[PDB]
Amino acid sequence: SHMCDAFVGTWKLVSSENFDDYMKEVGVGFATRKVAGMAKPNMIISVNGDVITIKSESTFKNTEISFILGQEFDEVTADDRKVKSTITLDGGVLVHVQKWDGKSTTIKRKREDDKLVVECVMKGVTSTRVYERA
Ligand SMILES: O=c1[nH]nc(-c2c(N3CCCCC3)nc3ccc(Cl)cc3c2-c2ccccc2)o1
């Protein structure tokens, strides 16, 4: 078994702060921001050996990434950016960096009490999204 153990499960969005502003800073257009911002996704995290899979299921888009910690991969984001992503496990936090067009955003996923707290940062703008077990 593993420490990445505390992330496995089906996590439903329960609260969001500043996500519209984060998306604006990322470069997401009006209509996509509106529709994406409405969604209440489930974030489904599973582990099989060294491979971690994170699925996002929602009324807007269903997305999935599978990766090995520390090993860069291709990701197409829900807003259709083509990004180069690397995910590491640092001090018990999953740290996800996306690079594209000379830009960068960092997404951290942390267990706090019975929640999964996700912090997304694009320059000075941070959004916090809180998820609970489904
Ligand atoms: O699992 C989920 N919850 N939220 C997302 C998520 C996201 N996340 C946040 C959680 C951590 C990984 C990054 N970044 C986005 C960036 C641009 C756009 Cl237009 C949408 C998203 C979305 C997204 C939102 C609503 C419906 C589907 C997807 O992915």
Side-chain angles (χ1 to χ4, degrees):
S1 322
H2 191 323
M3 186 269 153
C4 224
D5 282 33
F7 293 102
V8 164
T10 305
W11 298 94
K12 57 171 171 83
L13 185 71
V14 301
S15 72
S16 185
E17 291 288 351
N18 302 316
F19 192 60
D20 187 65
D21 278 345
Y22 170 78
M23 286 191 289
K24 277 186 179 183
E25 202 86 3
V26 163
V28 183
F30 180 90
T32 295
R33 288 201 317 279
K34 297 301 112 174
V35 173
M38 286 291 295
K40 292 287 182 150
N42 289 154
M43 183 187 302
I44 305 165
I45 305 177
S46 60
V47 180
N48 182 325
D50 292 334
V51 184
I52 303 166
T53 298
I54 305 176
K55 300 188 185 192
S56 180
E57 296 187 348
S58 72
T59 60
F60 170 52
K61 226 65 106 192
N62 297 323
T63 71
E64 172 179 335
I65 58 173
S66 291
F67 57 91
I68 298 175
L69 292 169
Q71 303 193 358
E72 184 165 62
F73 62 99
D74 292 321
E75 175 180 8
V76 177
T77 64
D79 61 309
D80 290 317
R81 290 173 283 130
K82 285 28 165 223
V83 309
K84 296 290 168 169
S85 289
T86 311
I87 304 177
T88 59
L89 184 59
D90 302 328
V93 176
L94 283 166
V95 182
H96 179 181
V97 180
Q98 299 177 330
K99 300 302 194 185
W100 77 103
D101 293 337
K103 305 177 185 178
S104 188
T105 185
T106 298
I107 301 143
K108 293 183 180 178
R109 296 169 171 92
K110 312 176 173 164
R111 278 294 313 278
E112 301 191 8
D113 302 319
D114 286 327
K115 301 170 197 202
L116 196 167
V117 179
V118 185
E119 286 166 3
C120 299
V121 175
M122 180 58 183
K123 295 179 284 171
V125 176
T126 309
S127 171
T128 303
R129 290 169 66 94
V130 179
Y131 302 72
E132 290 187 351
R133 294 207 185 256

